[PDB]
């Protein structure tokens, strides 16, 4: 089980992050940073980056200056058990595998085992 496939390795990107609201520095939501590969029209400012929400799973364009490391997998079961954007996010921090609803580039790699059998 290896299947060489380097999908741009990063520390901040490809991981869950907390987005700080511009209308409320307090309010923050989880989002899986990503790059506009498929989406073209999606114009990402120079000080902006594409992310993947863990609530509705929508594509938002925030500023990296609004993002900041977070501990979703460190959150209490109370927050996760409740907060969705967190839970899912956390799940991806434990299961390290987004839902088929995302289909990043692993959910498919799953398949029926390594290669039939």
PDB file of C-alpha atoms in Angstrom, residues 16-87:
ATOM      1  CA  UNK A  16      -7.797  21.930   8.647  1.00  0.00           C
ATOM      2  CA  UNK A  17      -7.439  25.587   9.559  1.00  0.00           C
ATOM      3  CA  UNK A  18      -9.452  28.212  11.397  1.00  0.00           C
ATOM      4  CA  UNK A  19     -10.725  31.133   9.355  1.00  0.00           C
ATOM      5  CA  UNK A  20     -11.173  34.423  11.172  1.00  0.00           C
ATOM      6  CA  UNK A  21     -14.290  36.336  10.196  1.00  0.00           C
ATOM      7  CA  UNK A  22     -13.800  39.898   9.013  1.00  0.00           C
ATOM      8  CA  UNK A  23     -17.156  40.871  10.469  1.00  0.00           C
ATOM      9  CA  UNK A  24     -16.321  39.178  13.750  1.00  0.00           C
ATOM     10  CA  UNK A  25     -12.711  38.383  14.562  1.00  0.00           C
ATOM     11  CA  UNK A  26     -14.289  36.164  17.192  1.00  0.00           C
ATOM     12  CA  UNK A  27     -16.390  33.944  14.958  1.00  0.00           C
ATOM     13  CA  UNK A  28     -14.179  31.411  13.222  1.00  0.00           C
ATOM     14  CA  UNK A  29     -14.901  28.422  11.014  1.00  0.00           C
ATOM     15  CA  UNK A  30     -12.871  25.390   9.920  1.00  0.00           C
ATOM     16  CA  UNK A  31     -11.772  25.057   6.313  1.00  0.00           C
ATOM     17  CA  UNK A  32      -9.433  22.747   4.436  1.00  0.00           C
ATOM     18  CA  UNK A  33      -7.102  24.986   2.467  1.00  0.00           C
ATOM     19  CA  UNK A  34      -6.677  24.004  -1.164  1.00  0.00           C
ATOM     20  CA  UNK A  35      -5.705  25.271  -4.595  1.00  0.00           C
ATOM     21  CA  UNK A  36      -7.959  26.267  -7.503  1.00  0.00           C
ATOM     22  CA  UNK A  37      -7.182  23.363  -9.803  1.00  0.00           C
ATOM     23  CA  UNK A  38     -10.561  22.489 -11.270  1.00  0.00           C
ATOM     24  CA  UNK A  39     -12.309  25.774 -10.579  1.00  0.00           C
ATOM     25  CA  UNK A  40     -11.120  28.403 -13.028  1.00  0.00           C
ATOM     26  CA  UNK A  41     -13.531  31.306 -12.725  1.00  0.00           C
ATOM     27  CA  UNK A  42     -12.894  31.183  -8.997  1.00  0.00           C
ATOM     28  CA  UNK A  43     -10.613  34.199  -8.860  1.00  0.00           C
ATOM     29  CA  UNK A  44      -8.294  33.999  -5.875  1.00  0.00           C
ATOM     30  CA  UNK A  45      -6.700  37.290  -4.898  1.00  0.00           C
ATOM     31  CA  UNK A  46      -2.960  37.448  -4.339  1.00  0.00           C
ATOM     32  CA  UNK A  47      -3.630  37.655  -0.621  1.00  0.00           C
ATOM     33  CA  UNK A  48      -6.371  35.058  -0.884  1.00  0.00           C
ATOM     34  CA  UNK A  49      -6.521  31.278  -0.999  1.00  0.00           C
ATOM     35  CA  UNK A  50      -9.153  28.644  -1.678  1.00  0.00           C
ATOM     36  CA  UNK A  51     -10.340  26.529   1.228  1.00  0.00           C
ATOM     37  CA  UNK A  52     -12.831  23.740   1.813  1.00  0.00           C
ATOM     38  CA  UNK A  53     -15.399  24.299   4.536  1.00  0.00           C
ATOM     39  CA  UNK A  54     -16.281  21.392   6.796  1.00  0.00           C
ATOM     40  CA  UNK A  55     -19.811  22.575   7.480  1.00  0.00           C
ATOM     41  CA  UNK A  56     -21.566  22.769   4.133  1.00  0.00           C
ATOM     42  CA  UNK A  57     -18.480  21.733   2.202  1.00  0.00           C
ATOM     43  CA  UNK A  58     -18.502  24.870   0.085  1.00  0.00           C
ATOM     44  CA  UNK A  59     -15.629  26.604  -1.666  1.00  0.00           C
ATOM     45  CA  UNK A  60     -14.782  29.899  -0.009  1.00  0.00           C
ATOM     46  CA  UNK A  61     -12.052  32.417  -0.736  1.00  0.00           C
ATOM     47  CA  UNK A  62     -10.514  33.906   2.385  1.00  0.00           C
ATOM     48  CA  UNK A  63      -7.216  35.603   3.143  1.00  0.00           C
ATOM     49  CA  UNK A  64      -4.311  33.604   4.521  1.00  0.00           C
ATOM     50  CA  UNK A  65      -4.070  36.469   6.983  1.00  0.00           C
ATOM     51  CA  UNK A  66      -7.476  35.448   8.279  1.00  0.00           C
ATOM     52  CA  UNK A  67      -6.414  31.834   8.647  1.00  0.00           C
ATOM     53  CA  UNK A  68      -4.473  30.485  11.603  1.00  0.00           C
ATOM     54  CA  UNK A  69      -3.477  27.059  12.867  1.00  0.00           C
ATOM     55  CA  UNK A  70      -6.143  25.360  14.949  1.00  0.00           C
ATOM     56  CA  UNK A  71      -6.597  22.263  17.078  1.00  0.00           C
ATOM     57  CA  UNK A  72      -9.743  20.545  15.862  1.00  0.00           C
ATOM     58  CA  UNK A  73      -8.464  17.083  16.697  1.00  0.00           C
ATOM     59  CA  UNK A  74      -7.679  18.563  20.091  1.00  0.00           C
ATOM     60  CA  UNK A  75     -11.190  19.880  20.603  1.00  0.00           C
ATOM     61  CA  UNK A  76     -13.452  18.254  23.204  1.00  0.00           C
ATOM     62  CA  UNK A  77     -15.953  15.592  22.211  1.00  0.00           C
ATOM     63  CA  UNK A  78     -18.533  18.115  23.354  1.00  0.00           C
ATOM     64  CA  UNK A  79     -17.586  20.589  20.650  1.00  0.00           C
ATOM     65  CA  UNK A  80     -17.147  17.923  18.000  1.00  0.00           C
ATOM     66  CA  UNK A  81     -20.200  15.949  19.051  1.00  0.00           C
ATOM     67  CA  UNK A  82     -21.940  19.242  18.377  1.00  0.00           C
ATOM     68  CA  UNK A  83     -20.158  21.674  16.089  1.00  0.00           C
ATOM     69  CA  UNK A  84     -20.337  20.055  12.644  1.00  0.00           C
ATOM     70  CA  UNK A  85     -17.687  22.059  10.834  1.00  0.00           C
ATOM     71  CA  UNK A  86     -15.446  20.902  13.657  1.00  0.00           C
ATOM     72  CA  UNK A  87     -16.479  17.268  13.893  1.00  0.00           C
TER      73      UNK A  87
END
